[PDB]
Amino acid sequence: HYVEPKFLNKAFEVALKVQIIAGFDRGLVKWLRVHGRTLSTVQKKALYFVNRRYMQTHWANYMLWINKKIDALGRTPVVGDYTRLGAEIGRRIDMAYFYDFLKDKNMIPKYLPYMEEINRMRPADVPVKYM
């Protein structure tokens, strides 16, 4: 039986998703220490979902950047290279600027069943589609 190759080794994909969501969530905890008392429980959960959805809709873009960086290492890539690239994305995107917008423009998403399903997943299992 033939094996379909993955477009990115699963250990590498996991290293990336874990670091990007941990970085996005860290910035959200810092913002919620200021604003958490003015938001309901389901609004707070919807903002953790926004983090996961932001990674999913920008995944093809991040892969363009990641591959440019990996194709340039001049040695074979190890999972630590993806852990370091993923931590860089997770740190650099200043998501608090987007949380301020959603709160101030009253656009936090209404919390829906699908959002809770995404939120309950391990960062490692959040589904991404390739480009």
Q: Which amino acid is at 122?
A: R
Buried b (16+ CB within 10 A) or exposed e, 95-110: beebbeeebeeeebee
CB-side neighbour CA atoms (13 Å) of 23 = 21
Spatial distance between the Cα atoms of 44 and 36, rounded to a whole number of angstroms: 7
- What is the CATH number for 47? 1.20.150.10
* Residue 23 belongs to domain spanning: 1-131
Task: Please say whether the beta carbons of 111 and 53 come within 8 A.
Answer: no
DSSP per-residue string spanning 35-50: HGGGS-HHHHHHHHHH
How many domains is the chain built from? 1
